[PDB]
Coordinates of C-alpha atoms in Angstrom, one line a residue:
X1 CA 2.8 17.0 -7.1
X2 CA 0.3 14.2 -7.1
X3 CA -2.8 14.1 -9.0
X4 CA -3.9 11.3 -5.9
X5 CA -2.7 10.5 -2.3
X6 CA -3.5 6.9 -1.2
X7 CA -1.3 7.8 1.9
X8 CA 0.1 5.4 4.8
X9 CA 1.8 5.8 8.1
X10 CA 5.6 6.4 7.2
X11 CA 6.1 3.8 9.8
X12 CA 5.1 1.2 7.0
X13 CA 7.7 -1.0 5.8
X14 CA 8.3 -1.2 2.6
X15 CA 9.6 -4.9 1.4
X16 CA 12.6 -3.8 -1.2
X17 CA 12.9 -6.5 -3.9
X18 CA 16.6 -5.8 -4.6
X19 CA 17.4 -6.3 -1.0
X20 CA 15.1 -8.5 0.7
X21 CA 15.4 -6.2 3.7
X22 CA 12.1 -4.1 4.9
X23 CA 12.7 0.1 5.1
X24 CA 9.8 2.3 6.6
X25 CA 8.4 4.4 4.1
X26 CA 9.5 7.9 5.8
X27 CA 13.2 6.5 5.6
X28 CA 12.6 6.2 1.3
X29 CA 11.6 9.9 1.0
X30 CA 14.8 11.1 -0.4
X31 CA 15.3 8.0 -2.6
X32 CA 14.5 6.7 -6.2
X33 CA 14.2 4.0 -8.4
X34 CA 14.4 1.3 -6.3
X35 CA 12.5 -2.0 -6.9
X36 CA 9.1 -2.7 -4.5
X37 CA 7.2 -5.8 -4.7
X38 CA 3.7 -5.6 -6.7
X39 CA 0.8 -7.4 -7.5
X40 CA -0.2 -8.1 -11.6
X41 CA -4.0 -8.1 -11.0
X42 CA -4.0 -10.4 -14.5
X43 CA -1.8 -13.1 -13.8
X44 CA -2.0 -13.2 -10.0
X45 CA 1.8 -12.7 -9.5
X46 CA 3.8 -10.9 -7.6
X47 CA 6.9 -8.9 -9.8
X48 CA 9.3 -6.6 -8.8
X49 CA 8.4 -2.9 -10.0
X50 CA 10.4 0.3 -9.8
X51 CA 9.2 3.0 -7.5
X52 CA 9.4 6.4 -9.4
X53 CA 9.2 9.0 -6.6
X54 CA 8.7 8.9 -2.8
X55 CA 6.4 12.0 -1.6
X56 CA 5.3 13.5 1.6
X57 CA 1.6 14.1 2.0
X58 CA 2.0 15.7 5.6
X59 CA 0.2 15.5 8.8
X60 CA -3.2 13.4 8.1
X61 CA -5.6 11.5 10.4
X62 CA -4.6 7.5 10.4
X63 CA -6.4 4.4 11.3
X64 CA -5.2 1.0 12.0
X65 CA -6.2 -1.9 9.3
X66 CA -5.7 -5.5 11.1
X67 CA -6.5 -8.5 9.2
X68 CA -6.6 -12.5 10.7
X69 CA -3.4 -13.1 10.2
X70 CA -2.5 -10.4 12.8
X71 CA -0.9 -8.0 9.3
X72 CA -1.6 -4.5 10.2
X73 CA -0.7 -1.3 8.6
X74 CA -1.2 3.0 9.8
X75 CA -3.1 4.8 6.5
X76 CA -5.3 7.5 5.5
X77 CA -8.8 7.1 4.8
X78 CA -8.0 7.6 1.0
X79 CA -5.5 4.5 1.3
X80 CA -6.8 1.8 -0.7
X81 CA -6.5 -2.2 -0.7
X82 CA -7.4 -4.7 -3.3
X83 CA -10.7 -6.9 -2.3
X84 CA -12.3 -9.5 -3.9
X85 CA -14.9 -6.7 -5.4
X86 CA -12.1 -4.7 -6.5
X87 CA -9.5 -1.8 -5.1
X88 CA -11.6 0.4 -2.2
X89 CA -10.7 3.1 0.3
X90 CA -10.3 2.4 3.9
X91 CA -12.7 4.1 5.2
X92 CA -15.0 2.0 2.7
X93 CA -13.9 -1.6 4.3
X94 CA -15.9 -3.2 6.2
X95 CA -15.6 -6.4 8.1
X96 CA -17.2 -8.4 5.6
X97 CA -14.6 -7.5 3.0
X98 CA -11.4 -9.7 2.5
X99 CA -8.3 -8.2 1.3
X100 CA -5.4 -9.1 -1.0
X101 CA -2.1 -10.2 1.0
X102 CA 0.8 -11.5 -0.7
X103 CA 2.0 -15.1 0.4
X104 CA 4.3 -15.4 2.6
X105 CA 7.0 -17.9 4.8
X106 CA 0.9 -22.2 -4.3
X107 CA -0.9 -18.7 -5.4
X108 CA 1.1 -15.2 -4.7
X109 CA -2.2 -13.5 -3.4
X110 CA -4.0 -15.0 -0.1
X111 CA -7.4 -12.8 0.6
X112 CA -7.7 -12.3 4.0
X113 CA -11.0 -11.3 6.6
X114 CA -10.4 -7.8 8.1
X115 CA -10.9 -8.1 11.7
X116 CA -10.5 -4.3 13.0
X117 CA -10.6 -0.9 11.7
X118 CA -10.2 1.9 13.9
X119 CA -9.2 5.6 14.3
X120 CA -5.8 6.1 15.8
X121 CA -4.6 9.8 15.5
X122 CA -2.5 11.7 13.4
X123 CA 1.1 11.0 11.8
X124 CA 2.9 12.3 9.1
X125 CA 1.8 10.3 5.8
X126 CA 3.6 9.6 2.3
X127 CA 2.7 7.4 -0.9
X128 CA 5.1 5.8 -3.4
X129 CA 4.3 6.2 -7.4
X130 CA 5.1 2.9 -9.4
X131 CA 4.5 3.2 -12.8
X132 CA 2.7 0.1 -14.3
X133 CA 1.1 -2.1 -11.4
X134 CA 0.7 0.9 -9.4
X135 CA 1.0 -0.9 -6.0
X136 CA 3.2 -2.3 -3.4
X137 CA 3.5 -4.4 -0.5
X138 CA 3.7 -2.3 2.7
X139 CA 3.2 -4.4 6.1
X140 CA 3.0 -7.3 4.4
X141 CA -0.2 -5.6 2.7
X142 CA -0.7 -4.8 -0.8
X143 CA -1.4 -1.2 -1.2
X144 CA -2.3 1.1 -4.0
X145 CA 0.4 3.5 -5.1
X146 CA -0.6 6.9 -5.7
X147 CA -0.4 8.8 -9.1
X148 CA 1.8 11.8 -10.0
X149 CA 0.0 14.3 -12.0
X150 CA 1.5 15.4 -15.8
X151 CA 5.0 17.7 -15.3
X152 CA 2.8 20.3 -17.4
X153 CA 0.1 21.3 -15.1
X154 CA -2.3 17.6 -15.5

């Protein structure tokens, strides 16, 4: 199973890096090894990375994460983003924090103002695990990946 669950809407779309083309998360579940697009927190890039497993977490409450820009993505309170202080849960944002988006249409990351946070109901949930960077873009959104615990018991 996994030793975390930073879980999100399965209505999130995952950008695939092989593909260009955008796939909500609940349509990856029984798929593997495919390349997501990541953040290196060191160099400020964003590099393809291989998702390792796709997992279910189940029905969870959700709330709604906009930002200026108008990105928004469905995630459990235990979801986390990347701000300027450093990777927090959701239901530890708060309008003052900005969070990491990659560029899109010169740096890869643009930090945007969150502008709402609110409670929305509850939806089946899943996380991705990505050995290495350990996130992905979902929504346009960075987003922590969760961790798989050890095969022997971890």
């Amino acid at each position: 199973m996994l030793r975390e669950s930073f879980a999100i809407s399965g209505d999130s779309l995952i950008s695939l890096a092989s593909t260009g083309k955008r796939v909500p998360i609940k349509d990856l579940l029984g798929e593997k090894d495919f390349e997501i697009w990541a953040i290196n927190e060191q160099t400020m890039k964003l590099e393809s990375a291989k998702v390792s497993r796709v997992f279910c977490t189940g029905k969870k409450l959700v709330y709604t994460l906009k930002t200026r820009l108008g990105r928004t993505i469905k995630a459990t309170a235990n979801a986390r983003f990347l701000t300027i202080d450093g990777w927090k849960r959701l239901d530890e944002l708060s309008l003052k924090e900005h969070i990491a988006l990659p560029r899109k249409l010169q740096s890869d990351i643009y930090w945007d103002p969150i502008v709402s946070i609110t409670e929305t109901g509850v939806e089946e949930v899943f996380d991705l695990t990505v050995p290495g960077l350990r996130n992905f873009v979902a929504n346009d959104i960075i987003v922590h990946a969760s961790i798989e615990q050890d095969k022997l018991g971890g």
